[PDB]
Design a protein around this ligand. Structure first.
Ligand SMILES: [Cl-]
Ligand SMILES: [Mg+2]
Ligand SMILES: [Mg+2]
Lengths: 242, 242
């Protein structure tokens, strides 16, 4: 009783493209050899269905969207959680109010709009706001490296709301994510833990700060760091060649 | 030298559907009878192209997107303006900072995310934030009717920034729009004013507070209030029957 869990983008696909027939064929073979298959990714179910095709729920035994906040097994939903349920309304409005005050009081050159986005699994917080142009993102990113605007805000929110038990993650150029501790990819492990002797995990972003790090490092998991989906295939072929 | 200008949704189409072949046929006939045709609508060019079809720039002599902030004539762009250019960066960040403080200091039950959206032609401002659920929009709307949260904010911004010369418009359930005075549909009139003796305007939202009101009422315009695109056709047939 083994299961093979895969990060999606970059692990089962070319980075920002749909899964190849090569990859599809190698998974088919793993399943008929008797492995269960699962997919876990930070992105929502629609996005995973885009990359992996429309028969996603038939092709994989488990699908964990938003790191497992929306979870399917054998084509049927069995778990749905969200940030609002974890935190509750009172804590959500307190956190967001503090974010808005903090961002309003910044002395930075450029601000636009969409400074605090409330998403199903996280707050996404942007000092400049996500309604900026790409040239503005480039500028801010450079401003940020010098002035550490995003790191200062994180410090401020961590010190204000330690009891909220939130983790914080710096994003591309203009933002950071805020989510309950544990709401990384390891969140899905509770759902397969008691049903498999061996859990392989495949991921391409497995170093410290990559979103595959915690699940890879987790002692419940046989981690495989891939550079590309073509390595994923190679590992699988080798698992199957035996 | 006459031109026929149309609001798009509800005027040339069923409310939230693409333009009919009936409507398309009646415009064809108006053009071969020697009228110029134009389209003006609050929504962006992509959206107008969705409703009116992909040959939009070939089917209409003038296309005015975002009320004419992006304007085409004879299939070619001739005007592009935006809120950031009108206001400038310093004024934009001052307005948005004040919005964020105001919204942070609200004593309302529910807030979520996306409180200030910076768009090409306007700020859209939401006390609860647009990342709320529909049930939350219903609740807020009811809360708002009792407590006048949105009207109070508008008063506050009008008194703070009179020199910015901004107009303010209450939206559906959760928001209001803020834009430079004159950036309603009459904005397009400067672009046809000196080229036509007669400018008909067709619109279905022509009463006070409707986004067709100013352009309809404007003395440069022969306004026609329609209930549906089928009335638009009738008026046109009558214009053409002569
Ligand atoms: Cl915001
Ligand atoms: Mg990846
Ligand atoms: Mg309309």
């Amino acid at each position: 009783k083994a299961i093979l869990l895969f990060d999606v983008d970059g692990t089962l696909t070319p980075p920002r493209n749909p899964e190849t027939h090569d990859m599809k064929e190698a998974l088919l073979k793993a399943r008929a050899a008797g492995f269960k298959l699962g997919v876990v990714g930070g992105s929502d179910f629609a996005k995973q269905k885009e990359q992996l095709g429309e028969s996603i729920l038939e092709d994989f035994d488990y699908v964990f969207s938003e790191n497992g906040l929306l979870a399917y097994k054998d084509g049927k939903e069995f778990h749905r959680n969200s940030l609002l349920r974890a935190l509750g309304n009172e804590k959500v409005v307190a956190f967001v109010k503090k974010c808005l005050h903090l961002i309003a009081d910044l002395d930075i050159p450029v601000q636009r709009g969409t400074f605090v986005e409330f998403r199903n699994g996280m707050f996404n917080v942007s000092p400049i706001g996500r309604n900026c142009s790409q040239q503005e993102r480039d500028e801010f990113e450079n401003l940020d490296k010098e002035r550490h605007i995003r790191e200062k805000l994180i410090r401020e929110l961590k010190e204000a709301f330690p009891d909220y038990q939130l983790a914080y993650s710096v994003g591309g150029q203009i933002s950071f994510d805020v989510f309950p501790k544990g709401w990384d990819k390891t969140y899905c492990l509770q759902f397969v833990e008691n049903d498999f002797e061996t859990i392989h995990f495949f991921g391409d972003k497995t170093s410290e700060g990559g979103n595959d790090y915690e699940i890879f490092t987790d002692s419940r998991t046989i981690g495989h760091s891939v550079k590309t989906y073509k390595d994923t295939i190679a590992i699988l072929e080798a698992l199957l060649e035996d």
